[PDB]
Write a protein that binds this DNA or RNA. Structure first.
Ligand SMILES: Nc1ncnc2c1ncn2[C@@H]1O[C@H](CSCC[C@H](N)C(=O)O)[C@@H](O)[C@H]1O
Length: 327
DNA sequence: CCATGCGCTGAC
DNA sequence: GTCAGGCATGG
């Protein structure tokens, strides 16, 4: 994460829905805002959260009486994506995990906050001939809010990882906000090799498979892109090897393969996966954040998460707009 | 609860 | 042609 000097959101309140590790809380707090309510139903996600923030989130949002929820100015939500991803079955609104958006709509109807801030995968903007996106837009306009949306890549915002996601921002109509803008990209200067831990700490993660087929030559000059150098088995998900002189592939939550969830990399002459701390760094978390004692739950948590840096820039732009009020 | 080999989709 | 992005079943 980055350091923020000018605290644009001081004085405001927000809620943390579909919480996870709490990536949305770290970003809004750095800008000055206060959290007054959080929700998340996973047993192990509730444990890490409490370890880092000192409070246990409330359970299953579908059984909560929205009238029970505190007053607030901004609603934060990074809802489930398994039903919308190109790696799954694209069932969408017909999937048991695909109707969470309607619970959000229901809460907004009662609480009517100033801003609603959501996040999902890239394919959300295309799914079902574009019907899925128009439905989200229409619901929001019907509730008296404006609708801004765009797809952004983490490699353009200072983090060495190829992660393309859609971001959706909505302002209440009586506020007449006419000057909101997504942030502008900038040159990358950090690569995978610059975030690695020492060899004496990851010996246990090295893999030696005899069906390895090196297909490309290592590069000596860094680049802002993924550079494949070889393969194992048939070369499907989790069986591909990359150079640390480029950028990292997308981290995942339910993925398989011998190099599961992180992918494989070439370090000092051998092939290995990434460690939980190296995972925290490619998502922008600081070294002071405590990871879960179970290595398996830690990999899954980081794979479902958000890149903090991209959220800090966007949150600052929301505040700049709310603060411009001339006579 | 944890490990791993797919086997297809989308955007080129 | 090329390559990046959860499900099913084993135990
Ligand atoms: N019905 C429900 N009630 C509460 N939490 C739910 C839920 N259905 C799914 N979830 C939670 O929604 C989360 C979506 S992934 C979100 C990660 C979070 N933005 C982060 O900053 O790390 C998962 O952790 C999942 O356990």
């Amino acid at each position: 994460m980055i350091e923020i000097k000018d605290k644009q959101l001081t004085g405001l309140r927000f809620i943390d829905l579909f919480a996870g590790l709490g990536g949305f809380r770290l970003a809004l707090e750095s800008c000055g805002a206060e959290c007054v309510y959080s929700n998340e139903w996973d047993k192990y996600a509730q444990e890490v959260y409490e370890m880092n923030f000192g409070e246990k989130p409330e359970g299953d949002i579908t059984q909560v009486n929205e009238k029970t929820i505190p007053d607030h100015d901004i609603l934060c939500a990074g809802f489930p994506c398994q039903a919308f991803s190109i790696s799954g079955k694209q069932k969408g609104f017909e999937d048991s995990r695909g109707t969470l958006f309607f619970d959000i709509a229901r809460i907004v109807r009662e609480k009517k906050p100033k801003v609603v801030f959501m996040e999902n995968v890239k394919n959300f903007a295309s799914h079902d001939n574009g019907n899925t996106l128009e439905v989200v837009k229409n619901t929001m306009n019907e509730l008296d809010y404006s609708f801004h949306a765009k797809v952004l890549n983490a490699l353009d915002y200072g983090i060495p990882q190829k992660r393309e996601r859609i971001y959706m921002i909505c302002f209440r109509n009586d506020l007449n906000i006419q000057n909101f803008q997504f942030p502008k990209p900038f040159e990358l200067n950090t690569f995978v090799k610059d975030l690695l831990l020492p060899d004496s700490e990851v010996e246990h993660l090295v893999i030696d498979r005899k069906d390895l087929v090196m297909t490309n030559q290592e590069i000596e000059q860094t680049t802002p892109k993924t550079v494949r150098l070889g393969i194992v088995g048939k070369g499907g998900q989790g069986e591909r090897i990359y150079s640390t002189r480029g950028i990292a592939i997308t981290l995942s939550a339910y993925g398989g393969g011998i190099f599961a969830k992180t992918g494989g990399y070439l370090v000092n002459g051998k092939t290995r996966k990434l460690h939980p701390r190296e995972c925290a760094r490619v998502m922008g978390y600081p070294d002071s954040y405590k990871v879960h004692p179970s290595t398996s739950q830690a990999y899954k948590q980081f794979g479902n998460s958000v890149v903090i840096n991209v959220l800090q820039y966007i949150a600052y732009n929301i505040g700049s707009s709310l603060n411009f009020k001339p006579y």
